[PDB]
DNA sequence: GGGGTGTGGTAGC
DNA sequence: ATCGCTACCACACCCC
């Protein structure tokens, strides 16, 4: 047990946090792409007609944690048992659940306690531990396989378990559903072999948004090919409103209020107007959804194809610790802030940059919220506060940055015992060149 | 037209 | 027990 005032807290928390792993893995994949392409020009031009293959592991952590499970779980059956990956037994996040579990309504992000109640009696939840190194090794085999196939002009990392793969079609060549199905089946088989038993699903289309939707329709362990020319009511009626990229719970609530609770993308596209859309969820998001309901990408989403090097380039650097934060005095808070700045500057030096603007954000216990929340060591119900500061000169100096971060904490006025979370941010990064004379 | 700030939401497991 | 990260767009609202 490592408490937050222990010097090892940051190391231990990040070693156990799957959300930290997800972000660190994604950051590393983007840096790797930039390094491998520093002298290449595989970007998509206006002259290119392309097919998108959106490829994603099915129930990634659950599949891999199963395939690598310890001898204690040897009898576990991936096809018949409801399986989750999680740390705990009660108010612990289900990071991933297999499709047996999902047949009872269990979802990624659910607490174990909530998921257990959806099982009929006699049906036992199997909880597997995280296998983080294995997750990374399987993802390595995934990206290795995608490259080795020599069928994509551009391979964009989305996450540890997901990539957007672009195939350029010469007008020389007549593309067909038959060829696309064969490519999907090749990819699915080669990844199944290369990962020793993991399955991917694939969405294949001529836009990013349709490929994402096709991917959802393909799961589990399948593929779907839906081009703009194949769109139909049957397609749109198959999707929930929050199946649309960019539509989470808050946008969903607004759409349901404005449009009389649509229950499918078909309902929505028959009811909406562009203007009512923009009024409900905002102008840019409204335009994105409007175009999406046409099967079309918006300008912002297309930038990753036209200029992947710019989109994938890191523009900020931060840490967030909103779990296990229980400090008794300002001395201990300040030491934790110093430890966090040390960690961030190590990352900042690895990428050979300085920073010209920093932010501290905190979570503070709501005045009427219990001191110990339902989730062990959780932040609970909180109010958020943030404050930023522009540095005079771009710098990587601990003394300057840590001192200003601690000043920023002081100006937010949160008593140490009320603190439930801290984020430390370098908002603007500046290159370091060969000329540092003045 | 340019700039700034803090806040909100989403994305992957 | 339990590990509720983190990058980045978009917004509302302020200044010249
Ligand atoms: Mg998915
Ligand atoms: Mg997946
Ligand atoms: Mg994924
Ligand atoms: Mg969505």
Coordinates of C-alpha atoms (C1' of nucleotides) and ligand atoms in Angstrom, one line a residue:
Chain A
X1 CA 0.0 0.0 0.0
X2 CA 1.4 3.3 -1.2
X3 CA -0.4 6.5 0.1
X4 CA -0.3 9.7 -1.9
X5 CA 2.2 11.3 0.5
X6 CA 4.7 8.5 -0.2
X7 CA 7.4 9.3 -2.8
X8 CA 6.4 6.1 -4.8
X9 CA 2.7 7.1 -5.2
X10 CA 2.9 8.4 -8.7
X11 CA 4.9 5.3 -9.9
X12 CA 2.5 2.9 -8.2
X13 CA -0.7 4.7 -9.4
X14 CA 0.4 4.9 -13.0
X15 CA 1.6 1.2 -12.9
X16 CA -1.9 0.2 -11.9
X17 CA -4.0 2.7 -13.8
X18 CA -5.3 1.3 -17.1
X19 CA -6.4 4.8 -18.2
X20 CA -2.8 6.0 -17.7
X21 CA -1.7 3.0 -19.8
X22 CA -4.1 3.8 -22.6
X23 CA -2.9 7.4 -22.9
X24 CA 0.8 6.5 -22.6
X25 CA 0.4 3.8 -25.2
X26 CA -1.4 6.2 -27.6
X27 CA 1.2 8.9 -27.1
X28 CA 4.0 6.5 -27.8
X29 CA 2.3 5.2 -31.0
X30 CA 1.9 8.8 -32.3
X31 CA 5.6 9.6 -31.5
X32 CA 6.6 6.4 -33.3
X33 CA 4.6 7.3 -36.4
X34 CA 6.2 10.7 -36.5
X35 CA 9.7 9.2 -36.1
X36 CA 9.2 6.6 -38.8
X37 CA 7.9 9.2 -41.3
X38 CA 10.3 12.1 -40.6
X39 CA 11.6 11.7 -44.2
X40 CA 8.5 10.0 -45.8
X41 CA 5.5 11.6 -47.4
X42 CA 2.7 8.9 -47.2
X43 CA 0.0 11.7 -46.6
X44 CA -3.4 11.7 -48.5
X45 CA -3.7 14.2 -51.3
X46 CA -6.8 15.6 -53.1
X47 CA -6.0 13.4 -56.1
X48 CA -6.4 10.2 -54.1
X49 CA -9.5 8.1 -54.0
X50 CA -9.3 5.9 -50.9
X51 CA -10.9 3.2 -48.9
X52 CA -10.8 3.3 -45.1
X53 CA -10.4 0.1 -43.1
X54 CA -11.1 0.8 -39.4
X55 CA -9.7 -2.2 -37.4
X56 CA -10.2 -2.8 -33.7
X57 CA -9.6 -5.7 -31.3
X58 CA -12.8 -7.2 -30.0
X59 CA -13.2 -6.6 -26.1
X60 CA -9.4 -6.1 -26.1
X61 CA -8.4 -6.4 -22.5
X62 CA -10.8 -9.2 -21.8
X63 CA -9.6 -11.3 -24.8
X64 CA -5.9 -10.7 -24.0
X65 CA -6.4 -11.2 -20.2
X66 CA -8.2 -14.4 -21.0
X67 CA -5.5 -15.8 -23.4
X68 CA -2.8 -15.0 -20.8
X69 CA -4.8 -15.9 -17.6
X70 CA -3.0 -17.6 -14.7
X71 CA -3.4 -21.3 -13.8
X72 CA -6.1 -20.3 -11.3
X73 CA -8.4 -19.5 -14.2
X74 CA -7.4 -22.4 -16.5
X75 CA -11.0 -23.8 -16.7
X76 CA -12.5 -20.4 -17.6
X77 CA -14.4 -20.5 -20.9
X78 CA -14.2 -17.4 -23.1
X79 CA -17.3 -18.5 -25.2
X80 CA -19.6 -19.4 -22.3
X81 CA -18.5 -17.4 -19.3
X82 CA -19.2 -13.7 -18.6
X83 CA -15.7 -12.2 -18.2
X84 CA -14.6 -8.8 -16.9
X85 CA -11.1 -7.3 -16.4
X86 CA -10.9 -5.2 -13.2
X87 CA -8.9 -4.6 -10.0
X88 CA -11.5 -5.1 -7.4
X89 CA -14.8 -6.6 -6.4
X90 CA -17.3 -3.8 -5.7
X91 CA -16.9 -0.2 -6.9
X92 CA -14.1 -1.1 -9.3
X93 CA -14.3 -0.2 -13.0
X94 CA -14.9 -3.0 -15.6
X95 CA -12.2 -2.0 -18.1
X96 CA -13.4 -4.6 -20.6
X97 CA -16.0 -7.3 -20.7
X98 CA -16.5 -10.1 -23.2
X99 CA -19.5 -10.5 -25.4
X100 CA -21.1 -13.1 -23.1
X101 CA -21.1 -10.4 -20.4
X102 CA -22.6 -7.9 -22.8
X103 CA -25.4 -10.3 -23.6
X104 CA -26.7 -9.5 -20.0
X105 CA -26.3 -5.7 -20.6
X106 CA -22.9 -5.3 -19.0
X107 CA -20.8 -2.4 -20.4
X108 CA -17.2 -1.2 -20.3
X109 CA -16.9 1.4 -17.5
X110 CA -19.6 -0.3 -15.3
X111 CA -18.7 -0.9 -11.7
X112 CA -18.4 -4.7 -10.7
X113 CA -21.1 -4.1 -8.2
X114 CA -23.6 -2.8 -10.8
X115 CA -22.7 -5.6 -13.4
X116 CA -23.2 -8.4 -10.8
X117 CA -26.8 -7.4 -10.4
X118 CA -27.6 -8.0 -14.1
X119 CA -26.7 -11.7 -13.9
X120 CA -29.5 -14.2 -13.3
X121 CA -29.0 -16.5 -10.4
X122 CA -26.5 -19.3 -10.9
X123 CA -24.5 -17.3 -13.4
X124 CA -21.1 -16.3 -12.1
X125 CA -19.0 -13.3 -13.1
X126 CA -15.4 -14.2 -13.9
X127 CA -13.1 -11.3 -13.0
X128 CA -9.6 -11.4 -14.5
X129 CA -6.7 -9.2 -13.5
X130 CA -5.0 -6.8 -15.9
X131 CA -2.1 -8.1 -18.0
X132 CA -0.6 -4.7 -19.1
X133 CA 2.6 -6.0 -20.6
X134 CA 0.7 -8.6 -22.6
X135 CA -1.8 -5.9 -23.9
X136 CA 1.2 -4.1 -25.3
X137 CA 2.8 -7.2 -26.8
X138 CA -0.5 -8.1 -28.6
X139 CA -0.8 -4.6 -29.9
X140 CA 2.8 -4.8 -31.2
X141 CA 1.8 -8.0 -33.1
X142 CA -1.3 -6.1 -34.4
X143 CA 0.6 -3.1 -35.8
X144 CA 3.4 -5.4 -37.1
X145 CA 0.9 -7.5 -39.0
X146 CA -0.8 -4.4 -40.5
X147 CA 2.6 -3.2 -41.9
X148 CA 3.7 -6.6 -43.1
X149 CA 0.6 -7.2 -45.2
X150 CA 1.8 -4.4 -47.6
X151 CA -1.8 -3.4 -48.5
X152 CA -2.2 0.0 -46.9
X153 CA -0.8 3.3 -48.0
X154 CA -1.2 4.9 -44.6
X155 CA -1.6 3.3 -41.2
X156 CA -2.8 5.7 -38.5
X157 CA -2.7 4.6 -34.9
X158 CA -5.9 5.4 -33.0
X159 CA -5.1 3.5 -29.8
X160 CA -3.4 0.5 -28.4
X161 CA -6.0 -1.8 -30.1
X162 CA -7.3 0.3 -33.0
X163 CA -6.0 1.7 -36.3
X164 CA -7.3 3.5 -39.3
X165 CA -5.8 2.0 -42.4
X166 CA -6.0 3.8 -45.8
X167 CA -5.9 2.0 -49.2
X168 CA -5.5 4.3 -52.2
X169 CA -7.4 3.0 -55.3
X170 CA -6.0 4.0 -58.7
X171 CA -8.5 4.9 -61.3
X172 CA -6.3 2.2 -63.0
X173 CA -8.1 -0.4 -60.8
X174 CA -11.8 -1.3 -60.4
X175 CA -12.6 -1.9 -56.7
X176 CA -15.3 -4.4 -55.8
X177 CA -17.0 -5.7 -52.7
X178 CA -15.4 -9.1 -53.4
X179 CA -11.9 -7.7 -53.2
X180 CA -12.7 -5.8 -50.1
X181 CA -14.1 -8.9 -48.4
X182 CA -11.0 -10.8 -49.2
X183 CA -8.8 -8.0 -47.7
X184 CA -11.0 -8.0 -44.6
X185 CA -10.7 -11.8 -44.2
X186 CA -6.9 -11.7 -44.8
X187 CA -6.5 -9.0 -42.2
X188 CA -8.7 -10.8 -39.7
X189 CA -6.9 -14.1 -40.2
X190 CA -3.3 -12.8 -40.2
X191 CA -4.0 -10.8 -37.0
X192 CA -5.7 -13.9 -35.4
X193 CA -2.5 -15.8 -36.2
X194 CA 0.0 -13.1 -35.3
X195 CA -1.6 -12.5 -31.9
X196 CA -2.1 -16.2 -31.1
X197 CA -5.8 -16.0 -30.8
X198 CA -7.1 -12.4 -30.6
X199 CA -9.9 -11.3 -33.0
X200 CA -10.4 -8.0 -34.7
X201 CA -13.4 -6.6 -36.4
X202 CA -13.3 -4.2 -39.4
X203 CA -15.4 -1.5 -40.8
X204 CA -14.7 -0.7 -44.5
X205 CA -16.0 2.3 -46.3
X206 CA -15.2 5.5 -48.2
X207 CA -15.4 7.8 -45.2
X208 CA -14.0 7.7 -41.8
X209 CA -17.3 8.1 -40.1
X210 CA -19.0 5.3 -42.1
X211 CA -16.0 3.0 -41.4
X212 CA -16.4 3.7 -37.7
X213 CA -20.1 2.8 -37.9
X214 CA -19.5 -0.2 -40.1
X215 CA -17.0 -1.4 -37.4
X216 CA -19.7 -1.2 -34.8
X217 CA -22.1 -3.2 -37.0
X218 CA -19.3 -5.7 -37.7
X219 CA -18.7 -6.6 -34.0
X220 CA -18.1 -9.1 -32.7
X221 CA -15.4 -11.0 -34.7
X222 CA -16.7 -9.9 -38.1
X223 CA -16.4 -7.3 -40.9
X224 CA -18.8 -5.0 -42.6
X225 CA -18.4 -3.1 -45.9
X226 CA -20.8 -0.1 -46.3
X227 CA -19.9 2.5 -48.9
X228 CA -21.9 5.8 -49.3
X229 CA -23.5 4.2 -52.3
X230 CA -24.9 1.4 -50.1
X231 CA -26.5 3.6 -47.5
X232 CA -30.1 2.6 -46.5
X233 CA -32.7 2.9 -43.8
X234 CA -31.7 -0.6 -42.7
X235 CA -28.2 0.7 -42.0
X236 CA -29.3 3.8 -40.1
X237 CA -31.9 1.9 -38.1
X238 CA -29.2 -0.3 -36.7
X239 CA -27.4 2.3 -34.6
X240 CA -27.9 4.2 -31.3
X241 CA -27.5 7.9 -31.2
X242 CA -24.3 7.6 -29.2
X243 CA -22.9 5.3 -31.8
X244 CA -22.0 8.5 -33.8
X245 CA -18.4 9.6 -33.2
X246 CA -18.5 12.7 -31.0
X247 CA -21.8 11.9 -29.4
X248 CA -21.4 11.1 -25.7
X249 CA -23.8 11.2 -22.8
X250 CA -24.1 15.0 -22.7
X251 CA -24.8 15.4 -26.4
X252 CA -27.1 12.4 -26.3
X253 CA -29.2 14.1 -23.6
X254 CA -29.5 17.3 -25.7
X255 CA -30.4 15.3 -28.9
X256 CA -33.1 13.4 -27.0
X257 CA -34.6 16.6 -25.6
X258 CA -34.6 18.5 -28.8
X259 CA -35.8 15.7 -31.2
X260 CA -38.4 13.8 -29.1
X261 CA -36.2 11.0 -27.9
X262 CA -35.0 9.4 -31.1
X263 CA -34.1 5.7 -30.6
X264 CA -32.0 5.2 -33.7
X265 CA -29.9 7.2 -36.2
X266 CA -32.8 6.5 -38.6
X267 CA -35.2 8.4 -36.2
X268 CA -32.8 11.3 -35.9
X269 CA -32.1 11.7 -39.6
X270 CA -35.8 11.7 -40.4
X271 CA -36.6 14.3 -37.7
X272 CA -33.7 16.8 -37.7
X273 CA -33.0 20.0 -39.5
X274 CA -29.5 21.3 -39.7
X275 CA -30.5 24.5 -37.9
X276 CA -32.3 22.8 -35.0
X277 CA -29.2 20.5 -34.7
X278 CA -26.8 23.4 -34.4
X279 CA -29.2 25.1 -31.9
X280 CA -29.3 21.9 -29.7
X281 CA -25.7 20.8 -29.6
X282 CA -23.7 23.7 -31.1
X283 CA -22.6 24.8 -34.6
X284 CA -19.5 22.7 -35.2
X285 CA -20.8 19.6 -33.5
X286 CA -24.2 20.1 -35.2
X287 CA -22.5 20.3 -38.6
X288 CA -20.4 17.2 -37.8
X289 CA -23.5 15.2 -37.0
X290 CA -25.4 16.6 -40.0
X291 CA -22.6 15.5 -42.3
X292 CA -22.2 12.2 -40.5
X293 CA -25.9 11.4 -41.1
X294 CA -25.0 11.8 -44.8
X295 CA -22.1 9.3 -44.3
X296 CA -19.7 12.2 -44.8
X297 CA -16.7 13.4 -42.8
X298 CA -16.3 16.9 -41.7
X299 CA -13.3 19.1 -42.4
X300 CA -11.7 18.6 -38.9
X301 CA -11.8 14.8 -39.1
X302 CA -10.2 14.8 -42.6
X303 CA -7.1 16.6 -41.3
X304 CA -5.7 13.3 -40.0
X305 CA -5.6 12.1 -43.6
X306 CA -4.4 15.3 -45.3
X307 CA -1.7 16.1 -42.6
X308 CA -1.2 13.2 -40.2
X309 CA 2.2 14.6 -39.0
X310 CA 0.5 17.8 -37.8
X311 CA -2.5 16.1 -36.3
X312 CA -0.4 13.5 -34.4
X313 CA 2.1 16.0 -33.1
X314 CA 1.9 16.5 -29.3
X315 CA 0.8 20.0 -28.4
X316 CA 0.4 19.7 -24.6
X317 CA 1.7 17.5 -21.8
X318 CA 0.0 16.9 -18.5
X319 CA -0.8 14.4 -15.7
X320 CA -4.1 14.0 -13.8
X321 CA -4.4 12.2 -10.5
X322 CA -8.0 12.1 -9.3
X323 CA -7.8 8.9 -7.3
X324 CA -6.1 8.3 -3.9
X325 CA -5.8 12.1 -3.1
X326 CA -5.9 12.4 0.7
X327 CA -3.6 15.1 2.0
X328 CA -3.5 16.5 5.6
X329 CA -1.5 19.7 5.1
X330 CA -0.1 22.1 2.5
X331 CA 3.5 20.8 3.0
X332 CA 2.4 17.4 1.7
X333 CA 0.4 18.9 -1.2
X334 CA 3.4 21.0 -2.2
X335 CA 5.7 17.9 -2.2
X336 CA 3.3 16.1 -4.4
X337 CA 3.1 19.0 -6.8
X338 CA 6.9 18.9 -6.9
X339 CA 7.0 15.2 -7.6
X340 CA 4.5 15.7 -10.4
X341 CA 6.5 18.5 -12.0
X342 CA 9.6 16.3 -11.8
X343 CA 7.7 13.6 -13.7
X344 CA 6.4 16.1 -16.3
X345 CA 9.8 17.6 -16.9
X346 CA 11.4 14.2 -17.5
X347 CA 8.7 13.7 -20.2
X348 CA 9.3 17.2 -21.5
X349 CA 13.0 16.7 -21.8
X350 CA 12.6 13.3 -23.6
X351 CA 10.9 15.3 -26.4
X352 CA 13.4 18.1 -26.3
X353 CA 11.0 20.9 -25.7
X354 CA 10.3 23.8 -23.3
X355 CA 7.0 25.1 -22.1
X356 CA 5.7 28.7 -22.0
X357 CA 2.3 28.2 -20.3
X358 CA 1.3 26.0 -17.4
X359 CA -2.0 25.1 -15.7
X360 CA -3.0 23.6 -12.4
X361 CA -6.5 22.1 -12.0
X362 CA -7.9 20.6 -8.9
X363 CA -11.0 18.7 -7.7
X364 CA -12.4 19.9 -4.4
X365 CA -14.9 17.9 -2.3
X366 CA -18.4 19.4 -2.7
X367 CA -19.5 21.1 0.6
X368 CA -22.3 18.5 1.1
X369 CA -20.4 15.5 -0.2
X370 CA -19.2 12.7 2.2
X371 CA -15.5 12.9 3.1
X372 CA -15.2 9.2 2.1
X373 CA -17.1 8.7 -1.2
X374 CA -18.7 5.5 -2.3
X375 CA -15.7 4.4 -4.3
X376 CA -12.7 3.6 -2.1
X377 CA -10.1 6.5 -2.5
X378 CA -12.4 8.0 -5.2
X379 CA -12.6 11.7 -5.8
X380 CA -16.4 11.6 -5.2
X381 CA -18.6 14.5 -6.0
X382 CA -16.4 17.5 -6.6
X383 CA -16.2 21.1 -7.8
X384 CA -13.5 21.8 -10.4
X385 CA -11.1 24.8 -10.3
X386 CA -8.3 25.7 -12.8
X387 CA -5.8 28.5 -13.2
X388 CA -3.1 29.0 -15.8
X389 CA 0.0 31.2 -16.0
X390 CA 2.1 32.4 -18.9
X391 CA 5.8 32.0 -18.2
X392 CA 8.1 34.9 -19.1
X393 CA 10.6 32.9 -21.2
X394 CA 9.9 29.3 -22.4
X395 CA 11.6 27.0 -19.9
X396 CA 12.3 23.5 -18.7
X397 CA 13.5 24.7 -15.3
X398 CA 12.2 22.9 -12.2
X399 CA 12.6 25.9 -10.0
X400 CA 10.5 28.2 -12.2
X401 CA 7.8 25.7 -13.0
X402 CA 7.3 24.0 -9.6
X403 CA 7.3 27.4 -7.9
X404 CA 4.6 28.7 -10.2
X405 CA 2.6 25.5 -9.9
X406 CA 2.6 25.9 -6.1
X407 CA 1.6 29.5 -6.5
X408 CA -1.3 28.5 -8.7
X409 CA -2.4 26.0 -6.0
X410 CA -2.3 28.8 -3.4
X411 CA -4.5 31.1 -5.6
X412 CA -7.2 28.5 -5.9
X413 CA -7.7 28.4 -2.1
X414 CA -8.5 24.7 -1.6
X415 CA -7.8 23.5 1.9
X416 CA -5.5 20.4 1.7
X417 CA -8.0 18.1 3.4
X418 CA -10.7 19.1 0.9
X419 CA -8.4 18.3 -2.1
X420 CA -9.6 15.2 -4.1
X421 CA -7.7 15.6 -7.4
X422 CA -4.9 17.4 -9.1
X423 CA -3.9 18.0 -12.8
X424 CA -0.6 19.5 -13.8
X425 CA -0.4 20.8 -17.3
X426 CA 2.2 22.2 -19.8
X427 CA -0.2 23.9 -22.3
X428 CA 2.2 25.3 -24.8
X429 CA 5.4 23.5 -25.9
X430 CA 8.3 25.3 -27.7
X431 CA 11.0 23.6 -29.8
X432 CA 14.7 23.7 -28.7
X433 CA 16.9 24.5 -31.6
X434 CA 20.7 24.4 -32.1
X435 CA 20.8 28.2 -31.6
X436 CA 20.4 29.1 -27.9
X437 CA 22.6 32.2 -27.9
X438 CA 19.9 34.6 -26.7
Chain B
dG1 C1' -9.8 41.5 -37.7
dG2 C1' -6.5 40.0 -33.7
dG3 C1' -5.8 38.3 -28.8
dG4 C1' -6.9 36.2 -24.1
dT5 C1' -9.2 33.1 -20.1
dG6 C1' -11.7 29.0 -17.7
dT7 C1' -15.0 25.4 -18.7
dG8 C1' -17.2 21.2 -21.1
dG9 C1' -17.1 17.2 -23.6
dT10 C1' -15.2 13.2 -25.9
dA11 C1' -12.3 9.2 -26.5
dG12 C1' -9.9 4.5 -26.1
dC13 C1' -9.8 -0.2 -22.2
Chain C
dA1 C1' -10.7 -2.2 -1.3
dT2 C1' -8.7 0.0 -5.8
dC3 C1' -5.6 2.5 -9.0
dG4 C1' -11.7 7.9 -11.9
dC5 C1' -5.9 9.3 -17.7
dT6 C1' -5.1 12.8 -20.7
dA7 C1' -5.0 15.3 -25.5
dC8 C1' -7.4 18.5 -27.9
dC9 C1' -11.5 20.6 -30.0
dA10 C1' -15.2 23.9 -29.1
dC11 C1' -17.4 27.1 -26.6
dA12 C1' -18.8 31.6 -23.8
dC13 C1' -17.1 35.6 -22.7
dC14 C1' -13.6 39.1 -21.9
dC15 C1' -9.8 42.7 -24.0
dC16 C1' -8.2 45.7 -28.0
Ligands
LIG1 MG1 -14.7 -0.2 -30.3
LIG2 MG1 -11.7 -2.7 -29.2
LIG3 MG1 -10.5 0.4 -29.5
LIG4 MG1 -19.8 7.9 -29.6

